[PDB]
RNA sequence: CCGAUAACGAACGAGACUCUGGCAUGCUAACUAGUUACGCGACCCCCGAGCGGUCGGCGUCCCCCAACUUCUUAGAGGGACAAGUGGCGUUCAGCCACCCGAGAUUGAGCAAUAACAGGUCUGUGAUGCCCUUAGAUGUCCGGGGCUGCACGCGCGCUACACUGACUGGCUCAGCGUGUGCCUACCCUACGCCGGCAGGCGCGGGUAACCCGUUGAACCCCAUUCGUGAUGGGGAUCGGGGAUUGCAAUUAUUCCCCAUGAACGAGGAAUUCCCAGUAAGUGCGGGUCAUAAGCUUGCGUUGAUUAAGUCCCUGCCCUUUGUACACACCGCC
């Protein structure tokens, strides 16, 4: 109990993770000596605390993508964003289940008769919207 | 081999119940040469649990603010108790302890705030250590004022209040106490 | 702390100045603030080419 | 004609009750019929796992 | 603190910080601290040991005539971060358990906004205003008083005893002080006298150099006592002897011989406290010409119970009600 870190060691831990991303690692004792060289602590109890909320979020960060900015996962993240477009679109398919109203919206558009649209039979029964109240 | 106070072997020592058998601490790893150790059993919960009830019998019997230092005192008062009782009995001093305790535990007892209707308004039954606990504190009692205001002396006292305790004949404090306990949780059942 | 003997009688002053950081120390303390940090800016150091060996 | 007195073993702790934590609240399995299991008040430090003497068996039952 | 989010970005407080305690056979360093070794001795065994045992006996920073820093000292550093493992958790913030570890919560100091008709004008040559100011409410000198007692209350000390009292022996501390601007008043070793309180000569220390290896008390080991208001308790009171002072009566204090009173564990009530803690036990400092039942610290011995709750007494946040706002000790 009352171990809770507060915004100093957070926010310093936080900044540096994302500044010396590859220099850091998952050792609590070599994360302590890159803080003295990488930033100025005014004391060895902040500087120890830092450097173990530091080992604490890097190993969230390789489990996962904490919210603290990385050059590789946003690297990653922009590929899987702007890339991957299959080589067929989504938007293509040979037949379209079409529905005979759209079907009548479409001959008073003007786009009647497509080869590329199957009619599907209406469905009967009107049974849409939920039971009301509960029960 | 280790031999409290140079003698009487705790091996042979048997407790007689498993209700208490992880809380008397008599047994060859908590075995003891002398019971005097600054073992920090009061640091955490449950760590007198494996503390030697020797040493709880120690620890207990230096009571009423004349005596709250005096564990040397204390501990010639228990070697020269066990002496007595090895005397009296034959069998082990240790035996004799283990047995008064087991028998001066209060099974249940009764506790409430509110309305009560006898002494308390519901009958609780009562957990082991707290049973271990009750136990020594009534035998150290009962000896306290056996001992008090007359030439026989808190050795002899405390001895056979433990001989008394161990059968159970009414003629020691402890079980007495513990009777009207039993009797009063079961008038607040 | 200072005392203003006015007519009404006695005002009491206090003045209290935080004084700035400096690692001169002529002006302010030379130590920093304890909870304060302080963090170097690093360099590119990319290096996204291939490895050579460059003769010195 | 009085009922034995019968063990039984903690299994959870349900928790603190008695309005001062004076009594801690458990869920206690029988040794006889350990498919039997009740809930009992005990006062005194219980940790789960041991066990205690029932001079009667059933008393109160009732979750926090 | 994580997160949600008409808020965003901050600031104080908390934390961080400083001192302290616990670990460093790792570093530096020691004749105002030591250890080890060696050499002189002193004594026992000397049957025979003999590199046998003891020495807080003497020497080896006397300057060439040993080293070393474990123990002591005090600096620089390290060391502990919920870091490692398991579980719980939104698997976040965190929590529980364990290993390894000296240590997995050592205690303090500082400590926000706003306020109280809280206390001090008897700390001040801090001070407004009023009063007095020569028959003084200034100042000095003498004496008395602040102590005075049918009674009530608070903080404490001593006890009611055998888990003890007395007598003797044995064996252990740590804080910290010590000769003065005025200002006189220090801490004391050793030797002699006295039964004691004390007195008289000789020194040492302005101090890790001397008191002092602070030979403390409790405790421990033996003796007597024997459940009685007793060898428990030491109040009250008589006689006598010293010390401080200018002066001891209304006894300053100390000492000796006498008296041995209430008190046999304490109603209703009520205080403090979670680990080197409570309590027992002494020792320093402050006050001090003389002096501690007080206080502030120090060590020594050293536990029972608990790791919970809102029952009582209160505190914090949210919702809610209000006829309160001097705020429920309100209002009516
Ligand atoms: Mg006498």
Redesign the interface.
């Given at each position: 109990m009352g171990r809770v870190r507060t915004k100093?060691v957070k926010?310093?831990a936080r900044?540096?993770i994302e500044?010396?991303y590859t220099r850091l690692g998952n050792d609590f004792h070599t994360n302590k000596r890159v803080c003295e060289?990488?930033?100025?602590?005014?004391?060895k109890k902040?500087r120890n605390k830092?450097a173990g909320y530091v080992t604490h979020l890097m190993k969230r960060i390789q489990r996962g993508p904490v919210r603290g900015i990385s050059i590789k996962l946003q690297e990653e993240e922009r590929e899987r964003r702007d890339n991957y477009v299959p080589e067929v679109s989504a938007l293509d398919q040979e037949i379209i289940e079409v529905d005979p109203d759209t079907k009548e919206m479409l001959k008073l558009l003007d786009f009647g008769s497509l080869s590329n649209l199957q009619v599907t039979q209406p469905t009967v029964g009107m049974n849409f919207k939920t039971p009301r109240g509960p029960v | 081999d280790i031999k409290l106070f140079g003698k009487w072997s705790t091996d042979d020592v048997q407790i007689n119940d498993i209700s208490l058998q992880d809380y008397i601490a008599v047994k060859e790893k908590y075995a003891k040469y002398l019971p005097h150790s600054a073992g920090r059993y009061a640091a955490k919960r449950f760590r007198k649990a494996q503390c030697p009830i020797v040493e709880r019998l120690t620890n207990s019997m230096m009571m009423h603010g004349r005596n709250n230092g005096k564990k040397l005192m204390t501990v010639r008062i228990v070697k020269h108790a066990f002496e007595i009782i090895h005397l009296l009995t034959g069998e082990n001093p240790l035996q004799v302890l283990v047995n008064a305790i087991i028998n001066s535990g209060p099974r249940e007892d009764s506790t409430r705030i509110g309305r009560a209707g006898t002494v308390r308004r519901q009958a609780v039954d009562v957990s082991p250590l707290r049973r271990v606990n009750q136990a020594i504190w009534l035998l150290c009692t009962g000896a306290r004022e056996a001992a008090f205001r007359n030439i026989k002396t808190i050795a002899e006292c405390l001895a056979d209040e433990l001989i008394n305790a161990a059968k159970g004949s009414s003629n020691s404090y402890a079980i007495k106490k513990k009777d009207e306990l039993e009797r009063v949780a079961k008038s607040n059942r | 702390v200072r005392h203003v003997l006015l007519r009404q009688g006695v005002l009491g002053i206090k003045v209290k100045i935080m004084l700035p950081w400096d690692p001169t120390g002529k002006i302010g303390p030379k130590?920093?603030?304890?909870?304060?940090?302080?963090?170097?800016?690093?360099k590119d150091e990319i290096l996204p080419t291939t490895p050579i060996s460059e003769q010195k | 004609r009085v009922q034995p007195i019968k063990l039984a073993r903690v299994t959870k702790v349900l928790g603190r009750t008695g309005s001062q934590g004076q009594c801690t609240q458990v869920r206690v399995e029988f040794m006889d019929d350990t498919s039997r299991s009740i809930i009992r008040n005990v006062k005194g430090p219980v940790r789960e796992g041991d066990v205690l003497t029932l001079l009667e068996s059933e008393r109160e039952a009732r979750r926090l």
């Amino acid at each position: 109990m009352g171990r809770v870190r507060t915004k100093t060691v957070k926010k310093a831990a936080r900044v540096i993770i994302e500044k010396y991303y590859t220099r850091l690692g998952n050792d609590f004792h070599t994360n302590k000596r890159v803080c003295e060289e990488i930033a100025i602590i005014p004391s060895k109890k902040l500087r120890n605390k830092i450097a173990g909320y530091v080992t604490h979020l890097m190993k969230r960060i390789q489990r996962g993508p904490v919210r603290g900015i990385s050059i590789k996962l946003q690297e990653e993240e922009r590929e899987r964003r702007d890339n991957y477009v299959p080589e067929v679109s989504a938007l293509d398919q040979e037949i379209i289940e079409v529905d005979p109203d759209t079907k009548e919206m479409l001959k008073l558009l003007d786009f009647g008769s497509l080869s590329n649209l199957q009619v599907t039979q209406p469905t009967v029964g009107m049974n849409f919207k939920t039971p009301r109240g509960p029960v | 081999d280790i031999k409290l106070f140079g003698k009487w072997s705790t091996d042979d020592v048997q407790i007689n119940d498993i209700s208490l058998q992880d809380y008397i601490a008599v047994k060859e790893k908590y075995a003891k040469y002398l019971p005097h150790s600054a073992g920090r059993y009061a640091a955490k919960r449950f760590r007198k649990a494996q503390c030697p009830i020797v040493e709880r019998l120690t620890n207990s019997m230096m009571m009423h603010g004349r005596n709250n230092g005096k564990k040397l005192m204390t501990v010639r008062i228990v070697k020269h108790a066990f002496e007595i009782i090895h005397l009296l009995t034959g069998e082990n001093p240790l035996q004799v302890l283990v047995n008064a305790i087991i028998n001066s535990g209060p099974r249940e007892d009764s506790t409430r705030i509110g309305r009560a209707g006898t002494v308390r308004r519901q009958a609780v039954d009562v957990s082991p250590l707290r049973r271990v606990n009750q136990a020594i504190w009534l035998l150290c009692t009962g000896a306290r004022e056996a001992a008090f205001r007359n030439i026989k002396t808190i050795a002899e006292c405390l001895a056979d209040e433990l001989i008394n305790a161990a059968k159970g004949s009414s003629n020691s404090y402890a079980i007495k106490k513990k009777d009207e306990l039993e009797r009063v949780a079961k008038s607040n059942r | 702390v200072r005392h203003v003997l006015l007519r009404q009688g006695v005002l009491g002053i206090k003045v209290k100045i935080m004084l700035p950081w400096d690692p001169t120390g002529k002006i302010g303390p030379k130590k920093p603030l304890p909870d304060h940090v302080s963090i170097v800016e690093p360099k590119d150091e990319i290096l996204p080419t291939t490895p050579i060996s460059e003769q010195k | 004609r009085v009922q034995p007195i019968k063990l039984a073993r903690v299994t959870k702790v349900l928790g603190r009750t008695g309005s001062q934590g004076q009594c801690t609240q458990v869920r206690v399995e029988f040794m006889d019929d350990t498919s039997r299991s009740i809930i009992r008040n005990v006062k005194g430090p219980v940790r789960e796992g041991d066990v205690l003497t029932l001079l009667e068996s059933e008393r109160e039952a009732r979750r926090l």
